[PDB]
Amino acid sequence: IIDGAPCARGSHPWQVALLSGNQLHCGGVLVNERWVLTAAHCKMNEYTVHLGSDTLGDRRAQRIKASKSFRHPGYSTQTHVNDLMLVKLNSQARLSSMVKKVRLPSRCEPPGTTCTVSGWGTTTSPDVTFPSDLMCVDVKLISPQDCTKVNSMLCAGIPDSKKNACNGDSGGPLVCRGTLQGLVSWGTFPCGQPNDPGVYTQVCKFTKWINDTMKKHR
Numbered sequence: 674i675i676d677g678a679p680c681a682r683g684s685h686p687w688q689v690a691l692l693s694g695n696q697l698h699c700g701g702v703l704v705n706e707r708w709v710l711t712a713a714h715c716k717m718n719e720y721t722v723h724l725g726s727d728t729l730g731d732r733r734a735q736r737i738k739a740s741k742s743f744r745h746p747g748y749s750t751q752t753h754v755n756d757l758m759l760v761k762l763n764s765q766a767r768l769s770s771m772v773k774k775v776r777l778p779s780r781c782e783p784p785g786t787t788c789t790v791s792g793w794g795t796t797t798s799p800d801v802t803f804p805s806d807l808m809c810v811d812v813k814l815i816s817p818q819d820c821t822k823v824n825s826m827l828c829a830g831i832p833d834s835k836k837n838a839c840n841g842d843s844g845g846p847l848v849c850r851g852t853l854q855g856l857v858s859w860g861t862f863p864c865g866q867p868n869d870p871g872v873y874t875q876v877c878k879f880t881k882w883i884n885d886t887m888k889k890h891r
């Protein structure tokens with residue numbers, strides 16, 4: 674996350690990280706005790722999922738192996754369309770005040786809405802600097818028609834501001850008015866240029882796919 678600040682402790686109990694061993698790979702969200710939602714670009718042969726702490730490596734965090742994952746069938750490596758994936762945990766996440774199911778959307782929040790994006794991705798660019806504490810930044814929703822770099826994607830940013838997501842933030846949540854509205858997808862490199870908004874998968878357009886994919890892989 675660029676030009677953000679540490680998230681208030683305990684305010685992201687539905688946030689997870691996908692690690693390759695102990696190395697950050699992507700963000701994600703906990704859908705339920707057996708499933709994580711992330712970006713399709715995050716695909717790996719297997720994952721270690723971090724839950725239950727704003728600090729990576731925290732001895733109190735839960736770590737769970739996840740062997741299986743399922744991309745949305747329309748995913749394009751070139752256009753970034755359909756950049757979402759479900760990761761099946763090998764063992765159930767233990768729920769508590771620090772591990773909670775995310776609130777999925779029932780409606781699409783419109784352009785102009787203030788939202789928050791969070792992650793453990795780099796805070797600098799092009800030099801990488803990975804924070805241990807989960808970082809947050811507030812950004813405003815931008816229609817894909819108003820987003821020069823781009824019907825199921827959104828952009829988000831603040832006019833004349835560097836605030837954005839970066840490497841390591843893919844798959845993490847963009848939340849608005851208490852619901853999940855986006856997953857970080859992609860943007861310009863180097864990160865953090867003003868008026869260069871990041872692109873997100875618009876979660877409200879994938880309700881059916883998320884529910885059905887989980888039901889088809891019980």
Ligand SMILES: COc1ccc(CCNC(=O)[C@@H]2CCCN2C(=O)NCc2cccc3ccccc23)cc1
Pocket residue numbers: 697698699714715794801837838839840841842843857858859860861862864870871872
């Ligand atoms: C030691 O150096 C290291 C260590 C680890 C890594 C892999 C770390 N993870 C990844 O970059 C993930 C993987 C899938 C795509 N990713 C994004 O975060 N994309 C999101 C993304 C990437 C670049 C610019 C962006 C601008 C705006 C919004 C999103 C952007 C790299 C260098």
